[PDB]
Amino acid sequence: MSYLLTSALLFALGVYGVLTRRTAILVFLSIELMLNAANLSLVGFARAYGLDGQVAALMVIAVAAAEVAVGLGLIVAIFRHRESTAVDDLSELRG
């Protein structure tokens, strides 16, 4: 149960991260931590329910990685000719 409290804390923490930082990459960083909070949770439940949450975790992991890549690709492509890093700064769309 302790562990499950811990997981929730890390989720919360990440949020505080995401919300404070206006620098996008650091946001993105935070996100990742939350995701892992999840995987911990899975492990806790695996102790109840029999280890399907391991396999789960693995799948999840892979997905996270995938979205990382793509997100960074975007991040790249955005500041491949632009020098900002915090991105509400860019607000061309707005209305």
């Binding site: 990459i25 492990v43 991040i75 890093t85």
Partner: protein, 160 residues
């Protein structure tokens, strides 16, 4: 139990604290690896061995490194680059953070389950048949997903 166990969670959480404070990108990132270190240890402690190794392999090995290459690429070791369009939002962030945990905590107070039906589960031995046969759908999905990702990723950089 709770002696060592207690400590490791303190530390883990601590690592978490660091990364959301740090405006030294590098310092941040570094902490997060150390995070995963603990987490991996804890995985093993909760008898998830394979998962332990993979945590390391992927995240630390690949993921953060890629991240790092970018931030180096973009020459920012710090998010301290401007000053915020809102600063009022900081305590408000902190407010919400408490709330989101509170609800989860409440929800989780009102139960306990088993935690006990196997041991030595981290072994790929018994995990293979499930994956191979049942999670196989997912597997194939995943495999394609990656491929698509690749193509996407490419398309991000140069057109076609």
């Amino acid at each position: 139990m709770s002696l060592l166990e207690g400590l490791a969670l303190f530390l883990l959480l601590l690592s978490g604290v660091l990364v959301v404070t740090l405006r030294n990108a590098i310092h941040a990132a570094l902490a997060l690896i150390l995070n995963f270190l603990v987490l991996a240890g804890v995985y093993v402690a909760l008898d998830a061995r394979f998962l332990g190794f993979i945590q390391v392999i992927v995240y630390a090995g690949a993921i953060v490194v890629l991240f790092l290459f970018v931030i180096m690429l973009l020459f920012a070791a710090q998010g301290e680059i401007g000053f915020d369009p809102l600063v009022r939002s900081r305590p408000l962030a902190a407010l919400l953070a408490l709330g989101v945990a509170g609800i989860l905590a409440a929800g989780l107070w009102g139960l306990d389950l088993a935690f006990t039906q196997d041991l030595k589960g981290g072994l790929p031995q018994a995990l293979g048949p499930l994956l191979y046969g049942d999670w196989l759908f997912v597997l194939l999905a995943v495999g394609f997903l990656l491929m698509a990702a690749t193509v996407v990723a490419v398309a991000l950089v140069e057109p076609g």
